[PDB]
Amino acid sequence: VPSWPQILGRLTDNRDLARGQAAWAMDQIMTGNARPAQIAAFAVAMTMKAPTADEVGELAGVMLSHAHPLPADTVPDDAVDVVGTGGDGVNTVNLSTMAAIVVAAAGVPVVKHGNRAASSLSGGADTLEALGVRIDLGPDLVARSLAEVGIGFCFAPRFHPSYRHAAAVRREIGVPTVFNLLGPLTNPARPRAGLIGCAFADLAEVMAGVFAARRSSVLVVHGDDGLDELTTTTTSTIWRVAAGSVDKLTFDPAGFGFARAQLDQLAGGDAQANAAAVRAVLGGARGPVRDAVVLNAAGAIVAHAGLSSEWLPAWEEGLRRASAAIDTGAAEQLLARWVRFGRQ
Amino acid sequence: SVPSWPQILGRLTDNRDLARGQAAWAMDQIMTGNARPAQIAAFAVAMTMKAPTADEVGELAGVMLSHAHPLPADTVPDDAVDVVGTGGDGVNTVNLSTMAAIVVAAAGVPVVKHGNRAASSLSGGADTLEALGVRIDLGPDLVARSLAEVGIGFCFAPRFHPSYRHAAAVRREIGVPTVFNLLGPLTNPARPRAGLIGCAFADLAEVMAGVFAARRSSVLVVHGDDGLDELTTTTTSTIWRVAAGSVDKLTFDPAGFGFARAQLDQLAGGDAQANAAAVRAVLGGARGPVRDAVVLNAAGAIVAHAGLEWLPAWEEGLRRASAAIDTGAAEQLLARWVRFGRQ
Ligand SMILES: O=P(O)(O)OC[C@H]1O[C@H](OP(=O)(O)OP(=O)(O)O)[C@H](O)[C@@H]1O
Ligand SMILES: O=P(O)(O)OC[C@H]1O[C@H](OP(=O)(O)OP(=O)(O)O)[C@H](O)[C@@H]1O
Ligand SMILES: [Mn+2]
Ligand SMILES: [Mn+2]
Ligand SMILES: [Mn+2]
Numbered sequence: 001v002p003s004w005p006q007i008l009g010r011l012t013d014n015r016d017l018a019r020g021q022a023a024w025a026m027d028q029i030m031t032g033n034a035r036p037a038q039i040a041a042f043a044v045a046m047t048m049k050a051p052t053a054d055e056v057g058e059l060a061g062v063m064l065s066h067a068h069p070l071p072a073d074t075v076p077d078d079a080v081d082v083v084g085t086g087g088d089g090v091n092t093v094n095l096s097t098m099a100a101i102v103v104a105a106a107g108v109p110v111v112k113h114g115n116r117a118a119s120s121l122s123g124g125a126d127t128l129e130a131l132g133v134r135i136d137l138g139p140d141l142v143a144r145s146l147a148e149v150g151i152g153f154c155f156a157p158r159f160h161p162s163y164r165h166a167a168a169v170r171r172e173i174g175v176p177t178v179f180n181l182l183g184p185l186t187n188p189a190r191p192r193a194g195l196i197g198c199a200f201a202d203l204a205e206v207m208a209g210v211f212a213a214r215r216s217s218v219l220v221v222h223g224d225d226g227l228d229e230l231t232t233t234t235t236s237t238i239w240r241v242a243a244g245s246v247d248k249l250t251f252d253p254a255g256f257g258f259a260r261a262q263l264d265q266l267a268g269g270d271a272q273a274n275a276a277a278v279r280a281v282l283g284g285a286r287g288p289v290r291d292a293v294v295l296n297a298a299g300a301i302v303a304h305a306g307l308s309s310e311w312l313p314a315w316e317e318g319l320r321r322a323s324a325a326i327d328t329g330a331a332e333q334l335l336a337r338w339v340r341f342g343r344q
Numbered sequence: 345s346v347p348s349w350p351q352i353l354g355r356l357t358d359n360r361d362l363a364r365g366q367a368a369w370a371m372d373q374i375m376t377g378n379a380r381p382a383q384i385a386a387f388a389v390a391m392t393m394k395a396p397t398a399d400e401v402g403e404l405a406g407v408m409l410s411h412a413h414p415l416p417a418d419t420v421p422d423d424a425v426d427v428v429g430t431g432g433d434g435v436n437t438v439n440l441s442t443m444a445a446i447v448v449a450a451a452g453v454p455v456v457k458h459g460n461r462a463a464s465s466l467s468g469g470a471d472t473l474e475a476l477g478v479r480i481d482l483g484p485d486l487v488a489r490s491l492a493e494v495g496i497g498f499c500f501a502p503r504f505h506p507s508y509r510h511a512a513a514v515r516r517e518i519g520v521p522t523v524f525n526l527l528g529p530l531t532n533p534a535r536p537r538a539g540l541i542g543c544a545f546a547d548l549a550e551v552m553a554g555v556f557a558a559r560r561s562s563v564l565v566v567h568g569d570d571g572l573d574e575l576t577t578t579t580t581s582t583i584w585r586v587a588a589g590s591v592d593k594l595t596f597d598p599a600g601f602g603f604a605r606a607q608l609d610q611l612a613g614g615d616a617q618a619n620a621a622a623v624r625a626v627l628g629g630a631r632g633p634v635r636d637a638v639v640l641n642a643a644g645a646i647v648a649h650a651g652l653e654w655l656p657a658w659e660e661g662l663r664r665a666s667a668a669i670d671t672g673a674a675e676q677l678l679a680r681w682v683r684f685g686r687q
């Protein structure tokens with residue numbers, strides 16, 4: 001029978017867990033039956049042991065079993081996510097949130113998982129909130145947002161109430177652990193595609209492994225400068241997940257005509273500063289930030305195409321649609337229509 | 345930089361040895377109620393899986409000792425010895441350290457024993473002593489009087505380390521052994537300079553030895569090659585011998601002193617009442633495998649005391665230990681120990 005001394009002892013002995021043990025642990029944590037000390041011990045122990053795809057898969061599986069689902073037949077089968085682990089410690093503009101809006105305006109259904117900042121000044125949820133977008137909608141209203149606007153936002157705490165004990169321990173110990181991976185892996189709407197950012201180069205492959213087990217079409221991205229984003233300051237490492245297999249690639253924006261940028265050119269601020277930065281990009285303003293948004297939006301579109309079916313043509317078409325979605329004003333319009341939807 | 349949990353924990357998760365003072369900072373935060381249980385647990389686990397260094401463990405123990413209740417000045421003889429282990433060998437044996445401690449004290453060697461109740465066994469040293477009528481929870485002044493009048497004193501770790509309670513609680517909750525399990529033997533409040541120190545975790549005995557070496561203590565850190573945190577009689581033992589601030593590892597065979605091979609079955613104990621009866625049995629002069637184990641461990645502590653020639657030291661240790669029992673001195677010392685607590 002499973003117990004904490006058994007599982008913790010196994011992890012501290014640097015052993016992989018038996019099937020079901022990670023699942024048992026997470027379920028204890030989600031049902032409020034685990035002491036903070038046990039939660040912390042488990043989180044740390046698994047991280048230093050080096051999590052397997054199976055183990056992390058079991059953790060996310062439990063979370064999704066307890067998560068508030070969206071109503072049946074309300075999420076298109078080709079819906080995409082654009083979200084990162086966060087915690088790169090750079091405080092950039094909200095590239096995922098900006099990319100998600102552009103991708104939606106390009107005609108790709110987007111059901112975005114998100115959350116407030118943890119280590120940054122303003123996270124996606126914070127910036128969206130500052131734009132007038134509603135980040136408090138339940139399953140039904142998110143479904144309506146998807147249908148009517150083309151984009152929905154699932155605020156993780158709203159859909160994962162049982163995760164509050166784990167989230168508290170994350171806050172207390174501060175150090176990143178395997179828990180930092182679970183957000184991007186537990187979109188309640190369960191889209192089968194997405195552009196997933198990972199700040200931790202050593203854990204990106206594991207994330208990709210989990211998505212692969214689900215037969216998802218995902219690009220797990222880690223900027224070689226440390227961003228949990230497709231960066232423009234240098235190359236990016238992409239773990240391409242397609243047909244249940246992971247393929248490690250290095251991506252260079254220069255190969256698609258993009259100039260190198262400095263990190264301070266992508267720097268952000270508070271929610272109001274970042275909101276203004278969203279408006280600028282969608283407004284047609286050229287520069288480093290636009291390039292970053294277009295590239296990331298294109299990545300999400302590449303991930304989308306990996307569902308129904310190569311690499312260079314997909315990116316070239318992705319870059320086209322993302323740029324066009326901005327230049328026609330569609331992305332700017334979608335945001336406006338999104339804000340109005342909430343007030344209605 | 346600014347000391348913080350994200351910093352230190354982050355360093356441990358990255359599998360880097362800590363900088364000087366960081367381990368001390370962490371332990372001090374824990375020892376002052378300024379650490380959340382989650383932070384306590386994260387640190388304990390992280391410090392364990394990285395693999396703690398002698399420097400780091402030394403800082404943890406140091407902080408504990410800098411907070412602990414000390415014994416009054418000039419109450420602890422300079423040649424006082426300790427007999428204690430980390431516990432957690434998994435084998436429910438009789439209480440060899442406590443029994444040896446009584447024998448050693450009866451032989452004339454001052455013993456100030458550190459100790460605690462059971463954590464995973466059916467009965468710890470403190471539990472068995474309590475069942476014998478010995479007062480275990482005495483404060484500094486009375487432990488000093490005990491040491492003077494009786495020739496032995498017992499420091500109950502919860503009594504002398506009240507600020508360790510938060511760490512102790514967390515250890516209880518997570519169950520798994522951590523670096524904290526090493527601290528007990530390393531934090532005797534009376535700070536005896538010699539001792540026989542048991543370590544259940546073979547891979548960490550050298551670390552414990554390094555800590556004692558840093559204090560230039562005369563210590564034998566023992567790990568039975570059958571898993572016991574004791575000098576065993578079922579097979580050979582690993583001894584990390586600490587003398588002159590230097591550690592030297594070696595294999596020890598009690599057969600070289602005439603001791604027959606025993607089996608773990610013969611050293612098995614039970615609850616406090618059973619183990620207490622086992623103590624009375626040995627001190628009564630009963631021959632058998634239990635007596636051999638006690639005399640062996642008692643001798644080791646005497647050898648450690650002497651460290652303040654290897655073979656002759658053991659021969660005199662085994663001789664003095666056997667005599668302390670057979671003369672009835674060890675039995676009498678226990679009885680006198682009980683009367684002290686009752687007056
Ligand atoms: O504070 P951090 O730990 O650094 O994380 C920053 C944000 O990144 C994650 O979401 P998201 O991918 O949507 O962020 P983004 O839109 O800004 O790119 C996370 O939910 C945070 O909101
Ligand atoms: O339950 P455990 O975790 O296994 O530990 C058993 C005992 O060992 C330690 O003391 P001590 O060295 O005095 O033990 P002993 O007298 O029985 O030999 C510890 O303080 C416990 O009292
Ligand atoms: Mn992001
Ligand atoms: Mn980011
Ligand atoms: Mn012992």
Ligand SMILES: [Mn+2]
Pocket residue numbers: 429431433437440542573574
């Ligand atoms: Mn023992």
